[PDB]
Every structure is written in C-alpha cells, then in structure tokens.
RNA sequence: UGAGUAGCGAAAGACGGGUGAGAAUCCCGUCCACCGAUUGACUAAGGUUUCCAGAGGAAGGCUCGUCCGCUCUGGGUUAGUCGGGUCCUAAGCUGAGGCCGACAGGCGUAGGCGAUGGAUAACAGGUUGAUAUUCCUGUACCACCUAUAAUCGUUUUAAUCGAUGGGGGGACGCAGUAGGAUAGGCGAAGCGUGCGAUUGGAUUGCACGUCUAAGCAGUAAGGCUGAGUAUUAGGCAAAUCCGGUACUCGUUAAGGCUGAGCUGUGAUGGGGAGAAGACAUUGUGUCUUCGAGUCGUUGAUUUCACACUGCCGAGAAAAGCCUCUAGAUAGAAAAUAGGUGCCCGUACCGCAAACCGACACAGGUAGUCAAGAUGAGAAUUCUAAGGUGAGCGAGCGAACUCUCGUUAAGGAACUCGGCAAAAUGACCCCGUAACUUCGGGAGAAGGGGUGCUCUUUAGGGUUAACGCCCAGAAGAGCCGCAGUGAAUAGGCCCAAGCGACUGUUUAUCAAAAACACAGGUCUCUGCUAAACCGUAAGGUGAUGUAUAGGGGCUGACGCCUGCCCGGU
RNA sequence: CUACCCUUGGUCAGGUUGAAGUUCAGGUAACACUGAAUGGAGGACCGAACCGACUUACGUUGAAAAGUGAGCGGAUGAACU
C-alpha cells in the first residue's frame, strides 16, 4: 500500500506515497468529465476570503453519482480509478442498460463485481439502500441528509459510519467523528467503508509537493506586525502575550466553540463528538 | 531598469477609453467635468 | 454614384509606370469597396476591368507656420483593365 | 559669479581621390581594425511617416558639417489563400426577465462579448528609389454561382438534404531514452568554372560552383487498432449511430486508421560558379546565346511525435469535422466550360539614435533563425554570412585618481577581518579519512600523465569492395624553459555556534540565525459546516464532507517533553 | 510599476550521478538473500542561455533618481517568462 522512498536527496528523505495498486485504469471516462478552473480561495468579488489556496496541478472534475437513485438494475464495476478532486478512489460502474457512472470506491470493491440500489438490494459492499432497509450494526458510507439530495456524509478515504438503532421516522447513526445523530430513514447510504485507507499515512515529504496540491504557505501570527495580526509585534520572539490565542480576525481560537445556536439539527444530534 | 509605463493600446483604451468612461456613473461625471472645463481631449 | 465613387486620377511616377502596364490609379471615396470601384470604372469609362487593388493612406502630419494639422486620409485604388483603355488627358 | 573652468556618454583608424565659400567630421576607393548564440537575419508589442527621391544648413546634432532619424518639396504601403473580421470558445467582462439594496447601485439566469489557445484554401521565381506569399511570370488550391452533363430519383418515398436534438471526434500533463527520416556540416583525382604565380620552391597547383517550391500521382521507416452478426430497462422523442449484452471467426497474421520522408511530375521552365557576342558621347549599364548538379561521410535542439515507455501532482473549452435519426422534398451530379470572391493591417524602426527610461542616455524589451576551426557544448579563441569603426579632435607622455601588467629578499609581519589580489581550474589514470539518516561525506584529500614524428598492431559504424568516419594499445625517436605551450574551466583542510534540507525576504544601506517548509500537537467544524468577503443578495470554503475544512503554536530526523488548574 | 491570483502560451547548450522496478545467474523446502545486467528516479550534481543579487572596486552636479567591471547563487523546479 505505502511505498517509502530511499533518501537519495534531503527532499525525498522520509517521503512516502501510495503505490496505487488498487487503481486498475489510469485514464478517466471522457464523457463524465467537466472543467474545474481554480478559485485560489477568491470569491465572487475577486477577493481572497480563504487563505492558503492557489496554484497546484490542473484537474478535471469527474461527475460522481452520490445519489445512487438508479434502482433495480445491476451495475458491473468496470474499473477503479484515481480522482484528483477527493481522497477516495472512484469506481466506474456499467449498468445493465449500458449507462455508465462513477461512484465512490468502497474498500474491497473489485473489478467485475455487481452493485445495486433500492429497497430490495442485498446488504453487500457497494449496494445503496434507504436507512429504513439497512440493518442495525451495519457499516455504511455516502449517507444522505435529505432524501434524494445525494450522499454528503462519510465520503473521504476510509470514512464510514455505523447504524445504531431505528426510531420512528429517524435512524440513529454513529459518524466517523464520534457524533451520534439521527438521520431521516428515507435517506440512503452505501454499504461498507470508503476505500483508500492508507491515504492519511502518506508523508508528503517536501514543500513543493504541497504546492503541487495547491496549498500556499501558512505564515504564523507571531511573526507578523500588530496591524497584521493580534499576535504581531513584540521585540524578538514573544509568547502569545494575552489571555487567549487569537485568529487573524481577532477571535479566540483555542477551545472557543463556534457552532451556532438555535439550529434545526440540535434536536437530531444525540451526542456530540 | 524596467520603468513604470509600458504602453499597450488595448489596455489604454479598455481602462481609460470613451466607452469605459460612459459605462459608469462616475465615468460620465469625468466626461462632464472635462467638457465643462472645455478640454479638447475627453478620453 | 460612380462619379462620386471615383474622386480623381493619381498622376505620379509610379502611377505612370502602372499606366504603362494598363493599370490606372484613382483616389476614391474612403467608404467604398473594391467592387464598387470596379463597377464605377466600368460605368464611366466603358472598359472591362480585370481586377482592382485598393489601399488606405493615413492622415499625414503637415505644418504651415505655427499651425499643426493633418492632411485628409486617402483611399487609393489601382484598376487593371482587361479590355480597352482610359485617356486621362 | 564660479570660468573659458567641469564636461563633450564604453571603441581604431590611415591615406588617396571627389565635392564645396568652407572638410579630422560629407561622398567614393584601398588598407587596417571590431562583433559574429552576433554589433548579423526575421518578427510580436510599442512608436506613428521616423520610410524614398530631390533640395537646404537658421535652430536641433554635446565639435564640425558640404551630412542627418533635422528643415523644405514631391512621393511611397496593392492579398479569396499572410495576421484579424464575415468561425470557435477560456479566464474575465456584460447581462433580458430575476434576487438584493436609503439613493446611487450590487449580484446574477438565459444570452452575448472576449486570444495568449482550437479551426481555416498558394507556392517558386522575377521586379522598384521606396511594397511584395499582396505587383508580374509560371503553376495551384478553397468557397460560391451559371450552363451542359455520363449516371441515379421521382411522394410510406429513399436519389438527395438533414437538425438549434443524440453520439463520436476535436481533446491536450511531466519525464526518459531508443529509433526512421530530413535540414545542415564535411570530404572527394566525380563533374563544372576561373586562374597558372617571379620572393627561394612547386605546378594533380590554387580558388570558386555543384540547385529548383506548392500542387498533383504514387510509394512507405514508424505508430495505433480484432472484425462480423443478432438483440436492447440507457443516450429527455427517435435512431440503422453510441453504450450494454450474446454468439461466430480471428489473434507473432489479414484488414482498417495514421505517418515523417522518398520517387515522378510540376520543369525542353526557373535559378546558376561562369563563357561568348554585342550595343553604347569612356562606361560595372543593359540585351541575345551558351553553362555542370555526382559519390561518400556526418547528422540534428527539425520532423515522425505526447508517438512509445514510465510516473503522480492525474494533465481547457467550444466550433470546424464525422455519424445518427426526428424531420424535409424530385430532384440530385461524377465530370466539362465559363464566371464571382468584401473589410481591416501591410511603409519604416523594432537588444533600438525611431520602443520604456525628460537626452541621438553604458539600463530594460516576448519569440524565431544562427555557418567554419576547437570542443561535451549555444562554453572558449579566431573567422564566415552579414554588419560596424561608435558625432569632438590634435599634442604632451608631470603630480594625483582610475583601469591593467610585472617585481629582489621575505610571505599575512597588513587589517576589525587575508578586504582585494594571488593561487586552484580542462581531460585521462592511480588513490581517497572521521562521521553517517548508509543516500552520502567525494572532484574528499594526495599523486602521475598531457606536444610532435615514425613503426607495429585489437577494434567499431557505413559499404560488393575501394573508400569515408570513429577510436584504441605497444615500441622507438625528436624539440623547448615550458606540450589542456593561447583562451575558457574547483583552492584545499581541521574545528565551533545557528538553521535540518531545496526555497523566501526589507524594488532602492539588512539575504540572515528572519519567513516558508515536510513532520508534531492543540483547537474549532455534522454540512445552508466552521472560518472568511459582503448592508444584503451572492460568494469563497467545495462542485469538498471529519483519512475533510479553518485557526493557534511548534518546525526534518533521533531521544525526549517534568511539577502547578490558586489567578486569567 | 509592484504583490498574490486566474486562463492560455513559451523557454531551460552540454556534461554527470544512477532510486524504485525488472531480467539472468547463484541460493532456499519455500522465502529472505547475493552478484551482474537492465532501468532512468531526484525541490540530485557540474555548467551556458535565463533568473537572481553575496563581496568588492568604480561611479556619487553619474553613462544610470540604484548602474558598470570583476568575482558570486539558482539553473527540471516551491523554475523562469
Ligand atoms: Mg490554512
Ligand atoms: Mg517581523
Ligand atoms: Mg491589535
Ligand atoms: Mg504579542
Ligand atoms: Mg525576549
Ligand atoms: Mg489590402
Ligand atoms: Mg585655458
Ligand atoms: Mg577653478
Ligand atoms: Mg583643470
Ligand atoms: Mg578636461
Ligand atoms: Mg562619444
Ligand atoms: Mg532617410
Ligand atoms: Mg554645431
Ligand atoms: Mg435589468
Ligand atoms: Mg491567436
Ligand atoms: Mg523595404
Ligand atoms: Mg622564383
Ligand atoms: Mg508590406
Ligand atoms: Mg515591411
Ligand atoms: Mg529578459
Ligand atoms: Mg562567445
Ligand atoms: Mg616579490
Ligand atoms: Mg621572487
Ligand atoms: Mg596580525
Ligand atoms: Mg598590526
Ligand atoms: Mg576575497
Ligand atoms: Mg536555512
Ligand atoms: Mg535593500
Ligand atoms: Mg544586499
Ligand atoms: Mg519557531
Ligand atoms: Mg510543557
Ligand atoms: Mg538541482
Ligand atoms: Mg528580490
Ligand atoms: Mg555581474
Ligand atoms: Mg548548490
Ligand atoms: Mg549549476
């Protein structure tokens, strides 16, 4: 899974990478591609509103079926492919009527395997079902919050959640974060865990590789000036020098909770992370 | 040493030209001011 | 409108050499096209026009005393006759 | 006033002959010198007439001026095919209705605009003072139109057109070698053309040339690719097209798609080192005829070609194009002949005296081409093609300042400090320590060799061979102070502090131990996420979803990170 | 002009080192493993173009309102344009 580079240079020293053995086709499905120009963290006013985004390799977008709403028709896993837009890999599947779609690639999905969706689908990896029909204790991913909107939860590499119980209109689920919350039982989920489990272990190794990923450098608050940052100024190095560490925009940033009050989901959230 | 002014017909027109001036309320105010003063060149 | 399309003939050394080659040079209305020039020539001089080349000349800076200005811009056509001849004199 | 003072802005000129009122400074000539990965040839921006011819010499020109990018007068830019428009879309801009907002107005859907990218039919020669793929000559190609048409159709059609729809295609990264070609280079007792030395010698001696496009027809190094037939929960309807599926045959083949180049033709034409005739008030000023095109070798940074192989960071769009139907309608056209084909740019400068720098300014300015000797090379030195001698000079050869060379004995005694300088420097061979994260340290260090002649002799590429090219080994000799004989080309070592490292920074006194960094950790955030911009709408986050996103601190890696929650 | 960014293009003589992987041979009960060859990695190495700006001399009513000479760093990349 993980390949460790030899220290031929100080740049490569301690660097690692995925071996991409899971990938079975190295080019994408042409008809499922769309252009994805970079925003570099700049909004519709043309202003930088999120720091540290910019540059990086050009990417095409792969249209991904998060909805899994094509029910009662088998689809055969043509290939597992790399996708630059997300940590998970993606499986190109071919339905029995000849329509082709990308899905998040679950752990253990193999080329030639069959997947299905709907209330009658079997409980096996890659099948999509309403939480109504998914048994208690099952590990799932790509979970909807609103029926028919498409999966929004547990889509990263290695992500999964566990079905815990079934109230009347809602099913209890334990999310990767540890939160236990209710989700409408008409919402769908895909059986299994998202694949590419070694993603998090990669040692990026050098600054340039982050740059290829489109991440620009993070300048620490303490090495700016007072007009730049609450931590700026001071002669020589200085400690934080106030009761709490502060964000660049002057808000406390260590332990201060920011979840807004009076949210609709607060009565659905059973146990915080 | 590279100097500040690097002329470019397209840039000059698109930034300071007649249609750019006309496309904004304040640009139209620029034109009105220059006409009032009696400028030969409005844009 | 042919008499408006054609303004005057051009008489220069280069134009005289062209005339030796059966090419007649005219200053024409700055708004007309090559086709209009051909049709005007055929209407006015009862010739058959083989082809028309055309070109524009920018206003040229010109001085007289302390007054600076420009000459008129010009549109100059060179009409190659297929049949016939034109006597400008 | 300073004062006839500082300065006259990187440089090599000399003389002869002209011209003129006047000449170091203008013109012509000879010789000399300078650049030549260029000071040469193109060209995009930018400038906008500075271009050409004739005339001038007030002012401008750092001197002069008979001259000029100056002044006067008159001229000069030619396109169906080159670049742009009548084609396409990217970022971005704009935006009917719409959403938002005291006003002003902001945002935004459909739709438009918008090259720096996609598509797209012409080449060679000749010609002027000034334009030329634009004019002329020759020979093409593209779209459209008209007439005549071998032939096919004639209303469910079936000849033909065909979507504003479907599908295919266009269509793409980075690196790495290998190969086929071609351009270009080089050689030749192949051929052609000149010349044949007076300074001692030679006369198979010396010098020069040794080509020709698009188009059309054929061919083919290489690259890629199974094909056929049935059927159909999909491609908003349909589909014979695409996708899916099943079967038959096939699979180091055949067929299909691509493809540099080559051959012929184009072309008894053009060009051509040159020769012979002439004409001419003297004529380098022009007319007619004639004039060779070979073989070998080398060989691309061009092309086949993002082809092939490998890789992770996973690499535009839309149209042109092809195809499918839904639809349309009696008519369609292989060929032949004739015809039609607009607008804009086109001059000139363009590593510069014409652009940006107030200057005829030692700066800055994207891209293309770029020969010989040497060499690994686009380095180095000298040359070619081509261009240039720099818009003040003449003397003198003081101090002093600058730039350069050398230096007895000594050799860091200088100095804040070896600052500067000196030394090292190429290629081959021998040889090379602690330490180490096992990669390194390393070109460690420290040594040896290097020219020329001749003899003998293992090879490799290309060829029937000869021949051409590459490339060693051994021995014997010769010369100098010295053989990478010039130029270009690391000084090395032992230790300590700091930062892991490659990077980044105070444009214009600080390049660092500062920033960043990969790694660590804390913390927020369940998605209309948190954070951020905005009054809002609308956005970034993210077409992401806790292996994710924001913020704080720490800063590779190794070993570790103790006690205190009273205060905030 | 300059900072960052967006889309779309361009450029980087020549030489060197030799990661992973693979094949062959050996080796093993089988693997480890060893050697050779192959292979062509890298914010890798030397060095022009190009980018930069460490030292120093010169210049300081400059040739230049930041330059020039000689050395200097990077030069397939977080490159330059
Ligand atoms: Mg950040
Ligand atoms: Mg600071
Ligand atoms: Mg403050
Ligand atoms: Mg402080
Ligand atoms: Mg302190
Ligand atoms: Mg024209
Ligand atoms: Mg005096
Ligand atoms: Mg004095
Ligand atoms: Mg004096
Ligand atoms: Mg003086
Ligand atoms: Mg001078
Ligand atoms: Mg002139
Ligand atoms: Mg004078
Ligand atoms: Mg409106
Ligand atoms: Mg273009
Ligand atoms: Mg010319
Ligand atoms: Mg003699
Ligand atoms: Mg022209
Ligand atoms: Mg020209
Ligand atoms: Mg430059
Ligand atoms: Mg040189
Ligand atoms: Mg001495
Ligand atoms: Mg001595
Ligand atoms: Mg001392
Ligand atoms: Mg002393
Ligand atoms: Mg020194
Ligand atoms: Mg450092
Ligand atoms: Mg500074
Ligand atoms: Mg400095
Ligand atoms: Mg720190
Ligand atoms: Mg502590
Ligand atoms: Mg490097
Ligand atoms: Mg800088
Ligand atoms: Mg320098
Ligand atoms: Mg270095
Ligand atoms: Mg280097």
GROMACS .gro file of N, CA, C and O (backbone and C1' of nucleotides) in nm, chain D residues 477-498:
model
  154
  882G        P    1   6.552   0.452  -2.894
  882G      O5'    2   6.529   0.556  -3.011
  882G      C5'    3   6.521   0.695  -2.985
  882G      C4'    4   6.468   0.770  -3.105
  882G      C3'    5   6.472   0.921  -3.094
  882G      O3'    6   6.599   0.973  -3.129
  882G      C1'    7   6.258   0.853  -3.166
  883C        P    8   6.657   1.101  -3.052
  883C      O5'    9   6.565   1.220  -3.104
  883C      C5'   10   6.558   1.253  -3.242
  883C      C4'   11   6.473   1.375  -3.264
  883C      C3'   12   6.491   1.487  -3.163
  883C      O3'   13   6.605   1.567  -3.189
  883C      C1'   14   6.261   1.447  -3.193
  884C        P   15   6.677   1.646  -3.069
  884C      O5'   16   6.580   1.768  -3.039
  884C      C5'   17   6.546   1.859  -3.142
  884C      C4'   18   6.440   1.956  -3.097
  884C      C3'   19   6.459   2.018  -2.960
  884C      O3'   20   6.557   2.120  -2.956
  884C      C1'   21   6.235   1.951  -2.986
  885G        P   22   6.630   2.155  -2.817
  885G      O5'   23   6.521   2.236  -2.736
  885G      C5'   24   6.486   2.367  -2.776
  885G      C4'   25   6.374   2.423  -2.693
  885G      C3'   26   6.393   2.424  -2.543
  885G      O3'   27   6.481   2.525  -2.499
  885G      C1'   28   6.173   2.354  -2.596
  886C        P   29   6.576   2.502  -2.371
  886C      O5'   30   6.475   2.510  -2.248
  886C      C5'   31   6.518   2.492  -2.114
  886C      C4'   32   6.407   2.526  -2.019
  886C      C3'   33   6.271   2.466  -2.052
  886C      O3'   34   6.258   2.333  -2.004
  886C      C1'   35   6.247   2.697  -2.004
  887A        P   36   6.189   2.219  -2.094
  887A      O5'   37   6.032   2.245  -2.078
  887A      C5'   38   5.968   2.237  -1.952
  887A      C4'   39   5.844   2.324  -1.947
  887A      C3'   40   5.732   2.287  -2.043
  887A      O3'   41   5.645   2.189  -1.989
  887A      C1'   42   5.777   2.520  -2.056
  888G        P   43   5.596   2.064  -2.076
  888G      O5'   44   5.513   2.128  -2.195
  888G      C5'   45   5.397   2.207  -2.172
  888G      C4'   46   5.300   2.188  -2.286
  888G      C3'   47   5.203   2.072  -2.268
  888G      O3'   48   5.079   2.117  -2.216
  888G      C1'   49   5.328   2.042  -2.467
  889U        P   50   5.015   2.054  -2.083
  889U      O5'   51   4.859   2.060  -2.114
  889U      C5'   52   4.806   1.993  -2.228
  889U      C4'   53   4.669   2.044  -2.265
  889U      C3'   54   4.658   2.192  -2.299
  889U      O3'   55   4.697   2.221  -2.432
  889U      C1'   56   4.481   2.129  -2.155
  890G        P   57   4.694   2.370  -2.490
  890G      O5'   58   4.813   2.443  -2.413
  890G      C5'   59   4.948   2.405  -2.433
  890G      C4'   60   5.041   2.508  -2.375
  890G      C3'   61   5.036   2.646  -2.441
  890G      O3'   62   5.064   2.746  -2.343
  890G      C1'   63   5.253   2.559  -2.461
  891A        P   64   4.951   2.798  -2.241
  891A      O5'   65   4.874   2.909  -2.323
  891A      C5'   66   4.933   3.035  -2.349
  891A      C4'   67   4.841   3.117  -2.435
  891A      C3'   68   4.702   3.138  -2.378
  891A      O3'   69   4.700   3.247  -2.288
  891A      C1'   70   4.688   3.074  -2.606
  892A        P   71   4.610   3.241  -2.155
  892A      O5'   72   4.462   3.245  -2.210
  892A      C5'   73   4.411   3.354  -2.286
  892A      C4'   74   4.267   3.329  -2.320
  892A      C3'   75   4.187   3.264  -2.208
  892A      O3'   76   4.130   3.360  -2.121
  892A      C1'   77   4.155   3.142  -2.409
  893U        P   78   4.111   3.330  -1.965
  893U      O5'   79   3.989   3.230  -1.962
  893U      C5'   80   3.861   3.272  -2.008
  893U      C4'   81   3.769   3.155  -2.028
  893U      C3'   82   3.759   3.057  -1.912
  893U      O3'   83   3.674   3.104  -1.809
  893U      C1'   84   3.780   2.938  -2.116
  894A        P   85   3.719   3.096  -1.655
  894A      O5'   86   3.700   2.943  -1.619
  894A      C5'   87   3.579   2.878  -1.653
  894A      C4'   88   3.580   2.732  -1.616
  894A      C3'   89   3.668   2.694  -1.496
  894A      O3'   90   3.594   2.616  -1.404
  894A      C1'   91   3.713   2.553  -1.682
  895G        P   92   3.575   2.667  -1.253
  895G      O5'   93   3.706   2.616  -1.179
  895G      C5'   94   3.744   2.669  -1.053
  895G      C4'   95   3.681   2.592  -0.940
  895G      C3'   96   3.734   2.624  -0.801
  895G      O3'   97   3.679   2.742  -0.747
  895G      C1'   98   3.717   2.389  -0.828
  896G        P   99   3.768   2.875  -0.736
  896G      O5'  100   3.893   2.831  -0.648
  896G      C5'  101   3.877   2.766  -0.524
  896G      C4'  102   3.976   2.654  -0.505
  896G      C3'  103   3.953   2.566  -0.384
  896G      O3'  104   3.852   2.470  -0.403
  896G      C1'  105   4.179   2.628  -0.390
  897C        P  106   3.767   2.418  -0.277
  897C      O5'  107   3.873   2.336  -0.192
  897C      C5'  108   3.939   2.224  -0.247
  897C      C4'  109   4.046   2.172  -0.154
  897C      C3'  110   4.002   2.141  -0.012
  897C      O3'  111   3.934   2.018   0.001
  897C      C1'  112   4.202   2.265  -0.006
  898C        P  113   3.820   2.001   0.112
  898C      O5'  114   3.901   1.988   0.248
  898C      C5'  115   4.007   1.895   0.261
  898C      C4'  116   4.090   1.920   0.384
  898C      C3'  117   4.016   1.931   0.516
  898C      O3'  118   3.979   1.805   0.569
  898C      C1'  119   4.177   2.103   0.502
  899C        P  120   3.859   1.794   0.675
  899C      O5'  121   3.921   1.853   0.809
  899C      C5'  122   4.036   1.796   0.870
  899C      C4'  123   4.066   1.863   1.001
  899C      C3'  124   3.945   1.879   1.093
  899C      O3'  125   3.921   1.761   1.167
  899C      C1'  126   4.065   2.084   1.081
  900A        P  127   3.775   1.732   1.227
  900A      O5'  128   3.765   1.833   1.348
  900A      C5'  129   3.658   1.924   1.354
  900A      C4'  130   3.682   2.034   1.454
  900A      C3'  131   3.555   2.105   1.496
  900A      O3'  132   3.487   2.037   1.599
  900A      C1'  133   3.713   2.265   1.427
  901A        P  134   3.327   2.026   1.596
  901A      O5'  135   3.280   2.166   1.653
  901A      C5'  136   3.322   2.210   1.781
  901A      C4'  137   3.281   2.353   1.806
  901A      C3'  138   3.137   2.387   1.774
  901A      O3'  139   3.045   2.343   1.872
  901A      C1'  140   3.276   2.553   1.684
  902G        P  141   2.890   2.330   1.835
  902G      O5'  142   2.842   2.481   1.815
  902G      C5'  143   2.840   2.571   1.925
  902G      C4'  144   2.779   2.703   1.886
  902G      C3'  145   2.640   2.699   1.825
  902G      O3'  146   2.537   2.677   1.918
  902G      C1'  147   2.775   2.848   1.702
  903C        P  148   2.404   2.597   1.874
  903C      O5'  149   2.343   2.685   1.755
  903C      C5'  150   2.293   2.816   1.778
  903C      C4'  151   2.235   2.877   1.652
  903C      C3'  152   2.134   2.792   1.576
  903C      O3'  153   2.005   2.796   1.633
  903C      C1'  154   2.290   2.879   1.423
   0.00000   0.00000   0.00000
